[PDB]
Every structure is written in C-alpha cells, then in structure tokens.
Amino acid sequence: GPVPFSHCLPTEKLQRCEKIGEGVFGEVFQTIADHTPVAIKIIAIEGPDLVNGSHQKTFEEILPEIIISKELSLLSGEVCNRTEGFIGLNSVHCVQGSYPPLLLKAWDHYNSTKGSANDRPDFFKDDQLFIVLEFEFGGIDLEQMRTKLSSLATAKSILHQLTASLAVAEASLRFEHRDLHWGNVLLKKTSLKKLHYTLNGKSSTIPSCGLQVSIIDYTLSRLERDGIVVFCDVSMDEDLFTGDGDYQFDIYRLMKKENNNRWGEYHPYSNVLWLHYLTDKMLKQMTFKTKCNTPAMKQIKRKIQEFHRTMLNFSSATDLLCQHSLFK
Ligand SMILES: Cn1cc(-c2ccn3ncc(-c4ccnc(CN)c4)c3n2)cn1
Ligand code: NA
Ligand code: NA
Ligand code: NI
C-alpha cells in the first residue's frame, strides 16, 4: 500500500525543495536526490475535498498520465524511434500524509514572488493519498525565457526540436500532447552543437544553439500501443473550452472541433495546432538579445513567419518535420 511522505521526501530533500510550477492537478517542486536535481509532481488522489476548483482524481484516473510519462521517458533509449525531447521519469510513488510544512514553506515563497492560482495545500489530513512523480530536471520553461533567448536562430532550433520530438512520438505511439502551452516547454543549456533523433529508423541532427528542449506535463495527453488507447476524457469538461485572453484557449476549442469531441481517437493535427500556438508566441510575445538586423538573421525571421502562415496546412508533426521548408 502507500508509503509515508518521508519515504519520498526525507528531511534533507524536503529542506532543499523550491516550488517551480503548478496546475489544477497540484504542485511541482525542484529538489536534490542523491546529489542530482529532480522535479517532483505531487497530485492529491482519492479524497473528497475540492482542490484547485476540481474534485480529486481516483488512482484509476491518474494511471493514464503515469503510463504516458513512462512511454515518453522510454523514447530516449529506443532505437528506431528515439528522442530525448520529452523528460525522464525516475519513479512513481503513492504517498500518505498531510502536506509537509516544508513544502508549504516553498509554496508560500512561490505565492509571495510569482503568485499562485491554487489553494494553499494545507487542508489535507494525515490519511490523504498523493501520487508523487519524480522526473529528471529539465531546466526552465519557455515563458520564463521569453526575454532571454539569443536570437530567432535559437527560436528556430526550439521549433525544430519540438517538431522532431512530437514526430517521433507520433510514429512510435500515435501521441498527442494536447496541452503544449509555453509553460510546458523546458530549456536547458548544453555544450552539444548537434542533437540527434531517429524517426522510423532514419537518424538526423538538429543544431542545438546551446539548448536542449524537453516537453513536459502529460495530464491531457493521448497515445496507444497495440490498439489500447490511453487518454484523458475531457468531452464533458465545460471550462476547458471557455477560456479567453490567449490563443492558448482557442487551441482547446480548435482541438475539440478537429476531433468532434471524441478524445479517444487519433488526431495528430492537435500537435500542429500547439506548434502553431508556440510559433505565435515566438513571433509576438518574445524578445531576443540579438535582433534580426543582419540579412542572415532576417531570412530566419521570414522563414519562421512563412512557417506560421503555412503550417496549419500540415496534418501532423511528422508531416511538418518531413515536408516543411523550415527544416530543409
Ligand atoms: C507538470 N509537470 C512539470 C514537470 C516537470 C518535469 C521536470 N522539470 N524540470 C524543470 C521543470 C520546470 C521548471 C520551471 N517551470 C516549470 C513549469 N512551467 C517546470 C520541470 N517540470 C512534469 N510534469
Ligand atoms: Na495539491
Ligand atoms: Na528531455
Ligand atoms: Ni521507493
């Protein structure tokens, strides 16, 4: 059965926790495990209390995310369809306990400095269950880097890396991310000049521009293996489709239009929609340290603009990667 919080989060680990992220699902912390940075996602399950606007999922309802996390993690070590463009999953635990005061301290700090949309997680009782997913530390999200990238050459690398990763997952797993907002794109420095992926047995390279991209957060994701589909059924969700103020919220509606509200089906066009949303963010909501005031860099900008205006005529990330001029 479940283990105590302290099994996953002994004092030293707890003392080094800093909150790095959140969602309706719960909370994400960074800490150190065996001298190694890790990210910990903590989800309340099986309880009756409202949490961040919603009822808690059951164990059965969080199993899809766990399975998808495992499958995408495996892609870094596969051969025919291989990418490091997701995030490694180190472990999963079911924990029982009230929320550790030291996590509440980290939570408070985050609320004080960035602000939170979540309820302070201080109302859980000592019998409360949680799922704790420990992930590889993937760096910092794209939104937080919105004024820090070197140039549009960097932006182009990011788009290429994202497209290739999604293509590899499409090919291997018929994967849709379904929620690839710019908080779910991580960037981490690398000294590698070229990154490698393999799609259906063919290996290719991408110039890194000094960054490795990781796609995270599989709460809404879908995939299948051997005819068994794993997904989040949002067909009766009202609020997911009623946001405004960001193109993000249009994507939810556009996905539902694409799939006729049948979330079990495979519609890799959803990956194209998210990549469109991300291309939009780069061109409109980001600022680079080197402006594109040289001919070479201005050509890159034009290519990203041309991508933005044509990519929605492609049927999948695989179609984009294999056929779009941006990646030739
Ligand atoms: C929901 N989820 C999140 C992760 C996950 C996994 C590994 N890392 N490594 C760094 C982050 C991170 C850093 C900064 N902002 C955010 C949130 N925008 C995340 C991270 N997040 C898994 N699932
Ligand atoms: Na929570
Ligand atoms: Na990665
Ligand atoms: Ni254990």
Residue 233 appears among annotated catalytic residues = no
Q: How far does residue 14's CA lie from ligand 2's centre (Å)?
A: 16
- On the CB side of 137, how many CA atoms lie within 13 Å of its CA? 17
Find tokens 């283990």 and name the residue. Answer: 3
Same domain flag for 116 and 1: yes
Burial of 165 (0-12, 13-18, 19+ CB in 10 A): buried
Residue 42: CATH number of its domain: 3.30.200.20
The number of beta carbons lying within 10 Å of the beta carbon of residue 289 is 10
The answer to whether the CB of 164 falls within 8 A of the CB of 194 is: no
Chosen domain end from 137, 164, 181: 137
Lookup: tokens for 7: 């099994």
To one decimal, the resolution in angstroms is 1.9
- The binding site for ATP consists of 20-28, 41, 136-141, 179-184, 217-219
Lookup: tokens for 111: 């609320």
Same domain flag for 326 and 231: yes
The answer to whether the CB of 270 falls within 8 A of the CB of 176 is: yes
Residue among 283, 281, 293, 326 at smallest CA distance from 307: 326
- Helix runs in the chain, H state only: 5-8, 11-15, 59-74, 101-113, 152-173, 247-259, 269-285, 295-310, 317-323
What's the rounded Cα separation, in Å, for the pair 264 and 280?
A: 28
Chosen domain end from 80, 105, 137: 137
The answer to whether the CB of 304 falls within 8 A of the CB of 162 is: no
What's the rounded Cα separation, in Å, for the pair 194 and 76?
A: 16
The answer to whether the CB of 103 falls within 8 A of the CB of 120 is: no
Lookup: tokens for 14: 């707890």
> Which residues, judged by CB distance below 6 Å to any ligand atom, belong to the binding site of ligand 1?
20-21, 28, 39, 41, 87, 135, 137-141, 183, 186, 216-217
Alpha carbon dihedral 99, 100, 101, 107, in 10-degree steps, equals: -70
Nearest CA to ligand 1 atom 1: 217
In three-state secondary structure terms, 26 is: strand
At 232, which amino acid appears?
C
| CB contact set of 7 (below 8 Å; sequence gap of 6+) | 93, 95
Contacts 24+ apart (CB under 8 A), 224-229: 224/173, 224/174, 224/266, 225/71, 225/173, 229/264
- Active site residue: 49, 179, 244, 250, which one? 179
CA distances to 181, 266, 269, 303, 317 from 274, in Å: 7, 15, 9, 18, 10
| CB contact set of 146 (below 8 Å; sequence gap of 6+) | 182, 281, 285, 286, 287
Range of the domain at 294: 138-328
What's the rounded Cα separation, in Å, for the pair 161 and 3?
A: 38
Same domain flag for 118 and 227: no
- What technique determined this structure? X-ray
Find tokens 């090919």 and name the residue. Answer: 171
In three-state secondary structure terms, 315 is: coil
